[PDB]
From a paper:
Our structural, biochemical, and enzymological analyses strongly suggest that FdlA-NTD utilizes catalytic residues different from other β-helix polysaccharide lyases, potentially representing a novel polysaccharide lyase family. Here, we report crystal structures and enzymological characterization of wild type (WT) and eight single mutants of the catalytic N-terminal domain (NTD) of FdlA, revealing its unique substrate binding pocket and identifying the key catalytic residues.
We first measured the enzymatic activity of 12 mutants and found that eight of them (D137A, K141A, H176A, F179A, E236A, R240A, Y242A, and Y242F) almost completely abolished their activities, H279A mutant retained approximately 65% of the activity compared with WT, while mutations of Asn243, Arg272, and Tyr322 to Ala only negligibly affect their activities. In addition, His176 forms a hydrogen bond (2.8 Å) with the hydroxyl group of Tyr242 side chain in WT, implying another possibility that it might play a role in providing a proton to Tyr242 to facilitate the catalytic reaction. Based on our structural and docking models, several positively charged residues such as Arg240, His176, and Lys141, located near the +1 subsite, potentially serve as neutralizers in FdlA-NTD, weakening the negative charge of the C-5 carboxyl group at +1 subsite, and making the C-5 proton susceptible to the attack by a Brønsted base.
Residue numbers in the entry: 1 to 443
The structure:
């Protein structure tokens, strides 16, 4: 019942067909610059466009090496390795690696999941090739950049009820690793997602070298010179939902925000954020995740974070995104450090908005002297200094339950009100707010 093919060339015709079961034979397949052209293997991007429905593709023991030169072979167009347009497809076990570090002519996405009821499982993806690489978003992630970018992102989940399951996604590229645009009921489950980090001090040491950042005197898009003392990811978000986007389902082009995302049992390491879903609508649910060495742990805006952990070595484990946040229910374990602390944000959590129920647990006994749980106040966050991103800082918190089962101190700013705090110790709580309740608990 399964058709086995032995070349990429033989594989491609099956992509336009419905109801097929195909296996690409174990082996290594290389895609080079010479494979792109009019009479070549790939005359268009996306390279692999899955247009059929109700099909299964088995990539067990297949290694697909794509030279990043391919990212420049299509003119000034976005290049995608895989795009799924059809429905009810299952793609499994592929090991895909970007070879070299050549940047795109415009931008690239490794995998794009449109349509409905699709699943990608057991993939091992390595993402490379982007510009600039080494600054994170300090010099621009969208329009009006200080340094123009050529981004290369990992898995873009769109469509309806699309499912990423048990994949490993390693990025050494400036771009989001797993992200959602116009996705309805996307699920990310059991994935390992990993970027890498660089200190702003190391970036600032490019002074006098003639680097791209040296040429702009390290002036960031946030309106100030890049500050020392922070650890940045070279990637964008680990798992991030966007509030805009376009998707294609059953012949229909759809422009909408992401809605109803679910993230289960994922591990995210060294990205700009662990799980950020505040811009998604509907029900947000995050369970069983581990976030290590990210610039921010969990920010879902509203919904449930349960049985999740994050360490605090490079940024807070928890951040309310806006003063409009409402109904954020979270139980987060502050994990032992995965490396030495280098947290310039001076906070393990920043809490605001209203009607939250927050529990923090930890076994940590050595508390860095700069780290505290903040309810309201002036977060010293890399991107929210000096009035930058003003809606994401300096906002009030009201009617919040805060169960602090940790040794971390708590600072309730004067803009806090009706905060019900329970804590292992009350001696390290500073309360400058209005009508707050503070009670001790035994352990």
């Amino acid at each position: 019942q399964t058709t086995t093919v032995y070349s990429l060339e033989d594989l491609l015709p099956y992509l336009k067909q419905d109801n097929v079961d195909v296996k690409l034979a174990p082996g290594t397949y290389n895609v080079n610059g010479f494979d792109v052209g009019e009479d070549r293997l790939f005359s268009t991007t996306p390279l692999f466009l899955f247009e059929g429905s109700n099909s299964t593709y088995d990539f067990t023991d297949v290694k697909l090496n794509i030279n990043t030169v391919v990212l420049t072979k299509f003119g000034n167009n976005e290049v995608n390795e895989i795009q799924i347009l059809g429905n009810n497809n299952v793609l499994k076990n592929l090991k895909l690696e970007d070879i070299g570090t050549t940047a795109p002519s415009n931008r690239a996405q490794s995998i794009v999941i449109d349509g409905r009821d699709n699943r990608i499982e057991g993939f091992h993806l390595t993402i490379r090739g982007s510009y600039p690489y080494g600054y994170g978003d300090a010099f621009g992630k969208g329009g009006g950049s200080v340094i123009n970018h050529r981004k290369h992102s990992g898995v873009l989940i769109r469509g309806l009820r699309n499912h990423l399951k048990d994949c490993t996604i390693i990025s050494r590229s400036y771009g989001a690793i797993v992200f959602m645009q116009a996705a309805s009921y996307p699920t990310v489950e059991g994935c390992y997602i990993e970027g890498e980090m660089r200190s702003t001090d190391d970036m600032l040491a490019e002074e006098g070298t003639g680097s791209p950042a040296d040429k702009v005197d390290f002036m960031t898009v946030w309106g100030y010179k890049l500050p020392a003392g922070y650890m940045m990811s070279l990637q964008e978000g680990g798992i991030r939902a966007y509030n805009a986007g376009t998707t294609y389902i059953d012949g229909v082009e759809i422009q909408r925000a992401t809605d109803n995302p679910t993230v289960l049992n994922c591990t995210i390491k060294n990205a700009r954020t662990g799980v950020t879903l505040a811009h998604a609508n509907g029900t947000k649910y995050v369970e069983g995740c581990t976030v290590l060495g990210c610039e921010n742990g969990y920010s879902i805006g509203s919904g449930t974070v349960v049985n999740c952990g994050a360490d605090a070595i490079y940024g807070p484990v928890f951040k309310n995104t806006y003063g409009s946040d409402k109904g954020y229910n979270a139980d987060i374990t502050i994990l032992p450090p995965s490396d030495a602390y280098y947290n310039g944000h001076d906070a393990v959590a920043y809490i605001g908005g209203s009607n939250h129920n927050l529990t923090f647990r930890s076994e940590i006994t050595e508390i860095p002297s700069n780290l505290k749980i903040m309810v309201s106040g002036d977060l010293q966050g890399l991107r929210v200094l000096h009035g930058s991103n003003p809606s994401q800082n300096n906002f009030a918190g009201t009617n919040i339950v805060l169960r602090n089962l940790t040794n971390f101190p708590v600072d309730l700013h004067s803009d806090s009100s009706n905060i019900t705090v329970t804590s292992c110790d009350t001696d390290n709580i500073t309360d400058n707010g209005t009508n707050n309740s503070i009670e001790a608990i035994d352990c």
